[PDB]
Design brief:
protein fibril, mainly beta, Major prion protein (chains A, B, C, D, E, F, G, H, I, J), 62 residues, Prion, homodecamer
């Protein structure tokens, strides 16, 4: 048996938090993958207080 | 048996939070994928207090 | 047996939260995918206090 | 057995929350997909206090 | 049996936190992958208070 | 017995609050007075978020 | 017994608060007074977030 | 017994707070006074986040 | 017994706080006074985060 | 018994705090006084983070 409980309220409760994000020409070319890929939290841009949870049992056959 | 309980209220309860996000020419070209891909939270733009959770058991056959 | 309960009210109850989001020419061209793809919360634009949860058991055959 | 109960009232009850979202020429063209894709919350524009939940058990055959 | 419970409230409750992120022309070309790849939290852009957790048992056959 | 248990946090919780005060030539005079005098909060200038409490049982014998 | 148990953390919690004060020639005269006088919080200037308390049992026997 | 247990941490928690004070020729006079006088917090200037407490049982015998 | 148990750590916790004070010719005269006088916190200048307390039981026998 | 147990570490915890003071010709006079006088914190200058306490039981026999 699996399981992943998460506890109570989070979040900013204090001072100052500033985030600037100015990339110029980011490129990400991907091709020809084969298998599965799990991930809890993927942040390719700008994130703050992002919680993610993933569960997977995939069966892939060729 | 699976399961992922999440607890009570999150969210800002404090000071200041500012987010600027100005990319110029981000490019992301992907092609020729094969298998499954789970994810809890995908944030490609701008996010704040983002909660995500995924559960999946896929079967893919060719 | 699966399950993913979520608890009570979240949301801003504090100070100041500002989000600017000005991409110039973001391009995302994807082609030739094959398999399933789960996701809890996908945010490609601007989000705040976004909760999402997905559940899937798909069977794909070729 | 499945099930994803959500609890009571959420929402802003505090200070200030401002969101500007001005992309210039975003392009997202996709083609040649094959299989299923679930998602709890998809926000491609501007969102705030968005709750989504999806359950799917599709069978796709070719 | 697996399992990964998490702690209670987290988040800024103190002083000042500033993050600038201005890459010039980051490129990431990946191709011809073979197998599974799990990850807890992938941050390719800008992140702050990002919590991720993934559990996966995939079976891939050729 | 007695007691005035003030409680709770208070203060500005968002919004705009402007206070102006330009009296020309205010005056006040009290020549002969005698006896007790107790006040909770007395404001002669601007004020603002002001809390005050007083508790007095004097004995005066002429 | 007696007692005024103030409590809680207070103060500005976000927003704008502007206070202006330009009295020209304010005056205040008191010539002959006699007896007790108790006050909780007295402000003749700006003030702002002000808290004050007082407890007094004088005995005077002119 | 007596006692005024002030408690809690207080102060500015984000936002803007501007205080101005430009009186030209304020005046004040008190010629003949006699008796007790107790105050919690007296502000003749700007003030700001000010806390004060006073406890007094004088016995005056003319 | 007596006692005023102040507690907690306090002070500025983020934000902007500007205080200005330009009185031109303030004055204050007191000629003849007699008797006790107790104060918690007296501010004749700027002030700022100011805390004060006072306990007194004088016995005066003109 | 007595006792005023101040506690906790305090001070500026992030943010901006500017204090200005340019009074032109302030004045103050006291000619004839007699009796007790107790104060917690008295400021005539800028002040700032100031804490003060006082305890006094004088006996004056004219």
């Amino acid at each position: 048996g699996w399981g992943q409980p998460h506890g109570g309220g989070w979040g900013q409760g204090g001072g100052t938090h500033s985030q600037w994000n100015k990339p110029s020409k980011p490129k990400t070319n991907m091709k020809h993958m084969a298998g599965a890929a799990a991930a809890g939290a993927v942040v390719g841009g700008l994130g703050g207080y992002v919680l993610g949870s993933a569960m997977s049992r995939p069966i892939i056959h060729f």
